[PDB]
């Protein structure tokens, strides 16, 4: 159940001693290393042509946050505050009140994307699939406060990315 | 008089060297440059919320530290994962072991000067990060291994790709080993370097390869076994001289034996669920959260309060690729930990750095900091 | 009410340790201003060391002043050995902080803090 | 259904808009105030009241496990529709 | 209780109970309690004067042979007059076992350093100085290891706040990173998550 | 597409020269891909 | 997989290994990115009878630690376990 | 011997590293917390708690968040008895005030009192 | 004295004659679960959540209304007690609506908390649920009667402490509905305290509705100044803004009630 | 048999392990005789040392002595006998057979609090 690495004794006949001296004087394993590097010279490299080629992803990928709507335009979020209760970074801040038709909705839904650890506990705690961590990873900003999303930015992320978010949830919800 | 150098932070490490010309008389590693106060932030967060901190301790051994914390919490909860979750944990723990030993060997060669097998083996490491992203959605910090099992079942066609990876990965190990093992320049940088006796290795709190390079026959997957490591068949590599070269060979052979374990885990994956079927610990399915009243109450209370862990203290140690990774978890009966000490192997290894670099030279210090696979996230917490 | 000592048996051995620590700091302050190339005078650094010693002058417990001498030794070790940078030395001089309001009336003006 | 303050600044679906004398409009000077133009309170008012022939109706928001938790709505009031508390859809017994 | 309940190991439980009797009767001078948890882990609660005699016993006695120091830990419990609880996790490779050795101190009583027994402690209890303020006597190099150099206070004490008292920022007047009193743009939101119903009747404490 | 290439090269995009009022002849940008093509291009699905 | 047989033969000679059998670039042998939908199994507690939670409770069968010795004959000297069984050498590849 | 005698009051205020602004100005409230009247369970009324007076919370100019400058705003300490909390507050130089534990007084419950012959305590319905 | 000895899980306790099983268990620190029992209302005995085994007795008894006899050993943790609790919690959650995200009582719900502590972790209910018509009892109490579990703390409070006699149960069986039977506006001077004693989200606070959530609120203990009674209150706040006012238990002032102006 | 290496780094091969273990075990018993009889350490250490010494005196072979001493290689059995000897020499000075030096405080090991 165990094996000894590096517990070989070299032979001491004239054959193997001359083999080790030929390896010393003729640099044979160094030529072996040159041969391996020369072998990789004549391979196709693994390099994709970004931005024109993209690395392969899965439908479970956890990128930029978005707030989804029902297929009637009504937003799914009903202010239950499970997502800021489970948020390990406390990146989510929610404030709510009943709006003009009596619906339980949020007035504040903020996600500090610089606090966020992108672990997706908010999408798996959400009982109505409102907050999702969608596919977008190319949302780098030139300013720190541009990574402090309010509810309007997250609803625009949902309206921007719903055509892809709904297909990823369709491909993945049976594992959940 | 004698020379005193400060190899500063220009992970990261400050080193105060007392040299006597070319020799090294004293090596003082000033650390704390990545001390973030993890195990104080754990105290104000629930057990599920404290789980993603363990991804970021040994940030090349993510699912291993997830597994150690999950085993600590499941030990205090007196529950056990389903068998399929156990085989998935051992499978991704050995994939994590391949990740960590590629990082270890290729950066240990990069710092010495062999910069090429770095690029050769990070494509394989890129494919294993695609396996992590397919199983969890993130490439490094998955938050996948949870107390109760894992978060989500394997997507269909993942095991065929783990097969296609594992079929070809031994040739990658062979061409790494072609570049470095019989190479006389690599041997001249690692043979007489940092010889650690077995008694001082037991005394200094060393663990893993740092013991097994010195001939100590100790592996926690054999002696104190966890999830299904008593059901897989593998060998434990043992060194002979306690140097950097034996520890290199032990890590290459642990890549070999991890490929062996991954083949056995692909051939022996059982059917079944992946969480514990106690819905007071692991959350219910989303189809039954949205239909059952008990399951909605349990979803609400697990994702807001969390499960209450019974009061007690445990030290749960697993065999992470850097060695014995331990969690001393103290629970006061609430849904948040009272205390979580994180034992990591690199802390005791970097404590023994000063003995290992006595009588050596300045360019041997980088070889000794390489043979102890030191990730400063796990050292400084 | 019988406790185990740290180094001192009563207050006089502790004042001996405080006195030798103050001597070591008083000798160190010119080297500290020199090699950190600080913008303070040597007299001003010595006044800061006098202020930091007189801040804790009310302590009548031997174990507490034992731990204060030990922590002053650790600060002096981090000062002699160049482990601190210029920023760590100058954190004793709260320069960029605003002057805090002292009387009742300005504290009434600026906020709610007593 | 957005509207606009007399400052020219757009009004959100909450009803938030900065005052005329508020300095915090200087963050929108040279830039834009990002509001969403699809107000959910206006989009849910466009949906027809579903006429059903039962006394108690159920709603899951559509999709089954893709919707909300399934709730039951009593339809005993002929004066008023029975609105789903999650998705905002509303129902009426047809008799 | 077959699928979902962790199985009890009564063999290791009886063995650790016998070895706890063994350690309690060989060393009655310091051993104050001996307890075995329901998941079969042994704790030896000793007096702080016997840190060196207990740890050298378990390291050297041929039935113990606890050669490895896995972990060294302090726990802050402010409701005790000896608030700090020093935990030694020991590994025997000969008998494949683990033992916990627990002692106690307050802020001012020093604990004797176990670097004579296990040199691994040379950083660990050094960490306990940086994090908890527990002084260790006869330590070779006792100083801070994890916090910043001018840091006042000990962070893992539970009367110490989650954030510090000072925060750093670069100031351009003095051309220097400076420390200022901490002011958060958003307060850390304390959640009161404890359920008011009793979860575990086995751990019920008797009332007054 | 080109299913003879290896996995990663087998799907690609040639960005337009003008999108939303910006001359993207040289300033090609990763965020120019609309989300219906973002599953196909990032291989989240097999289906265009 | 697109290399001509001259470059392929030079590459296999320079490496010394058969590289087309084990290529580190992935091709059509991988899984499809679009999969048929799963049907995940229920666990053992998904039953309608004999399924009381008081017979499968884990957190409430855990006990406080049993106090062996507290301060409020010719018995055998004991160890915390029997001594560790000596590891057998591997039969697969012991390097011996 | 190796044991000294310190008859002084225990005081660690110069060791804890707290700035003086948050020592001699803060008032620690030591109390058993009241039962949440939304609920009927009493597991939160078992332990003594030490909290502090609230300081100023204000609105963030950027996001509208609750900015604070109080480092001790989230500090809640748990104690088994009142005397441990008093000793811990005296040890740390914190001025304190102690609210006594309020316990519910024993109630005389009779189900038959709902159905009396001549008393006012009959229920009108059930 | 005249104290009779009873036993709770083998532990002896000395109780007054007339003391129930639930108070005898309270005297050793064990809290029997309950929904309809409240220590200031009359005893109803009609939710059956307090069913507990007395040993050498082949029937669980309602602990809130059963006086102890001298010599009983109350098994608060035995097998048939826990089976009684799981069965009663299954029937309570049979028709209860899946409204926990849209309910104000979530995070502070008795039905949630002791469904976690004492209920089963899943459902055997494969049927449709009842849905109850909502009532209108004023601008203070939001009434969502689908969430009602029919514990009749409404009726006992309005009948005994508020002295109103305008809440009651109309109907019979599963169709039994707590309400007023007419559009009557329940406006007492103590009309908000039924928000306190309702163990579920059937009666919530209408001004407090949807705004906050009880885990994120900081609880500050304070004094009422609306009247000269001196009622002990908890002001619960959230991010520097006052969210609501709750009573505190003071046995000599406001026992656990407050007036509607205070609330 | 002349075992070429022990396997453990820093531990050289002892040529005559039997006489070395006999000398170390009799020296352990000679140092251990200075402990009072009512101490449990003396009785337990005499018991295990007499078992080990009877096993050493029973077997002429080194390797079967390794398989029946049940302590690994014979050289780390020698090293553990040296550690036991130094331990007994410390235990004479410590005198830990005495009663408890101090009762703990009342809630010192009560968990949870
Ligand atoms: C040595 C000197 C160069 C001699 C020609 C040569 O070796 O061509 C590479 C050619 C291709 O090698 P390969 O590795 O088998 O490539 C397979 C690819 O699938 C074949 O590549 P592909 O299938 O992807 O086809 C596309 C490719 C087709 O490839 C070519 O056109 C090859 C380049 C020709 C110039 O065309 C391009 O990429 C356009 C490249 C244009 C610039 C090429 C460099 C110019 C250098 C002088 C300035 O090499 C050989 O055929 C073997 C060696 C021939 C030696 C000739 C005598 C000397
Ligand atoms: C450049 C700036 C660097 C700043 C240096 C910071 C180091 C400061 C370390 C602080 C060390 C102490 O505070 S220990 C002193 C505490 N001593 C006491 O509480 C006992 C009372 N001590 C005294 O009154 C002292 O003045 C004397 C000199 C010991 C006795 O004077 P009395 O007699 O009349
Ligand atoms: S992904 Fe995680 S850290 Fe980010 S908002 Fe969601 S729960 Fe919070
Ligand atoms: S996003 Fe989801 S979890 Fe968060 S408050 Fe809204 S409905 Fe609840
Ligand atoms: S009353 Fe309780 S169980 Fe019912 S919906 Fe509200 S929180 Fe959930
Ligand atoms: S509304 Fe509430 S208090 Fe009234 S009977 Fe129903 S559950 Fe009880
Ligand atoms: S509590 Fe006794 S039956 Fe309701
Ligand atoms: K209520
Ligand atoms: Zn709906």
XYZ file of N, CA, C and O and ligand atoms in Angstrom, chain C residues 11-12 14-22 25 28-29 32-33 38 40 42 44-61 64-73 75-76 79 84 88-90 92-93, chain E residues 152, chain H residues 14, ligand 2:
266
model
N 5.835 46.457 42.825
C 5.882 47.605 41.933
C 7.289 48.132 41.684
O 7.501 48.791 40.665
N 8.253 47.857 42.562
C 9.570 48.468 42.401
C 10.387 47.792 41.302
O 11.083 48.472 40.538
N 8.965 46.412 38.791
C 8.258 46.863 37.605
C 8.684 48.269 37.203
O 8.826 48.554 36.012
N 8.899 49.157 38.176
C 9.387 50.494 37.856
C 10.823 50.458 37.360
O 11.210 51.296 36.543
N 11.613 49.488 37.832
C 12.932 49.239 37.257
C 12.838 48.881 35.780
O 13.605 49.397 34.951
N 11.879 48.017 35.431
C 11.708 47.633 34.031
C 11.176 48.785 33.178
O 11.623 48.968 32.036
N 10.240 49.577 33.720
C 9.741 50.773 33.032
C 10.874 51.764 32.803
O 10.992 52.367 31.727
N 11.753 51.899 33.794
C 12.844 52.855 33.724
C 13.861 52.452 32.668
O 14.290 53.288 31.867
N 14.215 51.162 32.612
C 15.153 50.704 31.590
C 14.547 50.744 30.189
O 15.258 51.041 29.218
N 13.241 50.475 30.066
C 12.572 50.609 28.774
C 12.550 52.058 28.300
O 12.769 52.331 27.112
N 12.301 52.999 29.216
C 12.330 54.413 28.861
C 13.732 54.853 28.472
O 13.896 55.682 27.571
N 14.266 53.565 24.872
C 13.558 54.419 23.915
C 14.218 55.781 23.751
O 14.290 56.310 22.631
N 17.018 55.394 21.587
C 16.691 54.975 20.229
C 16.143 56.102 19.355
O 16.421 56.107 18.150
N 15.394 57.049 19.928
C 14.742 58.154 19.195
C 15.624 58.929 18.200
O 15.150 59.168 17.076
N 15.999 56.602 15.302
C 14.702 56.456 14.652
C 14.396 57.644 13.748
O 13.897 57.467 12.634
N 14.703 58.861 14.202
C 14.506 60.034 13.355
C 15.506 60.031 12.201
O 15.181 60.461 11.088
N 12.671 60.946 9.292
C 11.432 61.566 9.724
C 11.568 63.084 9.720
O 12.664 63.638 9.830
N 10.217 65.033 11.974
C 10.095 65.529 13.332
C 11.484 65.814 13.891
O 12.497 65.305 13.410
N 14.188 65.582 17.158
C 14.495 64.564 18.160
C 13.769 64.872 19.463
O 13.289 63.959 20.151
N 10.857 66.319 19.682
C 9.438 66.028 19.512
C 9.161 64.532 19.615
O 8.156 64.121 20.206
N 10.054 63.703 19.072
C 9.936 62.268 19.268
C 10.124 61.856 20.716
O 9.440 60.956 21.209
N 11.032 62.528 21.428
C 11.192 62.254 22.852
C 9.989 62.722 23.661
O 9.627 62.078 24.654
N 9.339 63.809 23.242
C 8.094 64.212 23.887
C 6.973 63.225 23.607
O 6.117 63.011 24.467
N 6.963 62.612 22.422
C 5.969 61.582 22.147
C 6.219 60.332 22.980
O 5.268 59.705 23.459
N 7.486 59.970 23.191
C 7.781 58.824 24.047
C 7.420 59.133 25.499
O 6.871 58.281 26.208
N 7.649 60.373 25.937
C 7.228 60.793 27.273
C 5.709 60.785 27.413
O 5.184 60.376 28.454
N 4.992 61.205 26.368
C 3.532 61.165 26.376
C 3.012 59.733 26.420
O 2.059 59.437 27.147
N 3.633 58.827 25.664
C 3.184 57.439 25.649
C 3.540 56.699 26.930
O 2.860 55.730 27.282
N 4.588 57.128 27.634
C 4.848 56.574 28.961
C 3.923 57.157 30.023
O 3.473 56.429 30.913
N 3.620 58.453 29.955
C 2.743 59.064 30.949
C 1.268 58.796 30.697
O 0.448 59.124 31.558
N 0.914 58.249 29.534
C -0.468 57.854 29.286
C -0.900 56.715 30.200
O -2.059 56.667 30.626
N 0.019 55.814 30.538
C -0.290 54.637 31.335
C 0.199 54.761 32.773
O 0.364 53.743 33.449
N 0.419 55.986 33.259
C 1.071 56.191 34.551
C 0.175 55.860 35.740
O 0.684 55.707 36.854
N -1.130 55.741 35.534
C -2.079 55.492 36.611
C -2.168 54.029 37.028
O -2.901 53.722 37.972
N -1.460 53.125 36.360
C -1.617 51.697 36.611
C -0.877 51.323 37.889
O 0.305 51.645 38.055
N -1.577 50.641 38.801
C -1.018 50.223 40.082
C -0.973 48.703 40.225
O -0.917 48.188 41.346
N -0.986 47.977 39.112
C -0.964 46.522 39.056
C 0.362 46.071 38.468
O 0.729 46.547 37.387
N 0.017 44.209 34.909
C -0.380 45.061 33.794
C 0.806 45.873 33.297
O 1.037 45.977 32.088
N 1.602 46.429 34.213
C 2.790 47.147 33.771
C 3.871 46.198 33.285
O 4.694 46.602 32.463
N 3.870 44.936 33.734
C 4.731 43.928 33.116
C 4.386 43.738 31.647
O 5.270 43.772 30.785
N 3.097 43.566 31.340
C 2.699 43.413 29.943
C 2.896 44.699 29.146
O 3.181 44.637 27.947
N 2.806 45.864 29.795
C 3.107 47.116 29.103
C 4.587 47.232 28.767
O 4.941 47.723 27.690
N 5.464 46.790 29.674
C 6.897 46.784 29.390
C 7.218 45.797 28.275
O 8.026 46.092 27.389
N 6.552 44.639 28.272
C 6.756 43.641 27.219
C 6.304 44.179 25.862
O 6.994 44.009 24.848
N 5.177 44.894 25.832
C 4.702 45.449 24.569
C 5.544 46.637 24.112
O 5.747 46.817 22.907
N 6.077 47.430 25.045
C 7.042 48.452 24.675
C 8.344 47.876 24.156
O 8.955 48.444 23.251
N 8.772 46.738 24.707
C 9.924 46.019 24.169
C 9.661 45.526 22.755
O 10.553 45.569 21.906
N 7.533 46.887 20.563
C 7.551 48.076 19.712
C 8.975 48.568 19.471
O 9.318 48.987 18.358
N 9.826 48.498 20.492
C 11.219 48.894 20.333
C 11.986 47.924 19.446
O 12.884 48.339 18.713
N 11.146 48.799 16.054
C 11.746 50.069 15.656
C 13.245 49.957 15.375
O 13.728 50.524 14.387
N 9.070 48.048 11.014
C 8.206 49.177 10.728
C 8.742 49.966 9.542
O 9.946 50.001 9.284
N 4.500 53.460 9.977
C 4.231 52.861 11.277
C 4.832 53.680 12.402
O 4.279 53.717 13.507
N 5.966 54.329 12.147
C 6.545 55.213 13.148
C 5.703 56.471 13.280
O 5.414 56.928 14.392
N 5.251 57.023 12.158
C 4.497 58.267 12.218
C 3.032 58.089 12.611
O 2.334 59.095 12.762
N 2.100 57.286 15.503
C 1.983 57.886 16.828
C 1.646 59.365 16.737
O 0.984 59.908 17.627
N 2.093 60.025 15.675
C 1.803 61.433 15.436
C 0.560 61.504 14.561
O 0.639 61.378 13.339
N -2.605 48.108 17.819
C -2.933 48.041 19.234
C -4.168 47.181 19.439
O -5.120 47.239 18.656
N -5.448 49.582 29.817
C -4.274 50.011 29.072
C -3.704 48.910 28.189
O -2.743 49.160 27.455
C 8.882 57.835 18.612
C 7.595 57.498 19.366
C 7.499 56.049 19.838
C 6.548 55.946 21.031
C 7.090 54.956 22.063
C 5.924 54.188 22.678
C 6.416 53.278 23.803
C 5.529 53.478 25.032
C 5.461 52.193 25.858
C 4.581 52.415 27.088
C 5.206 51.715 28.296
C 4.415 52.071 29.553
O 3.532 52.925 29.520
S 4.851 51.200 30.978
C 4.639 52.531 32.214
C 3.492 52.288 33.189
N 3.961 52.451 34.573
C 3.097 52.502 35.597
O 1.881 52.413 35.468
C 3.705 52.653 36.983
C 3.881 54.135 37.253
N 5.117 54.539 36.590
C 5.588 55.779 36.674
O 4.999 56.685 37.264
C 6.897 56.033 35.909
O 6.955 57.414 35.549
C 8.166 55.664 36.710
C 9.344 56.359 36.047
C 8.432 54.166 36.656
C 8.067 56.079 38.181
O 7.659 57.442 38.316
P 6.927 57.906 39.677
O 7.764 57.513 40.832
O 6.956 59.506 39.537
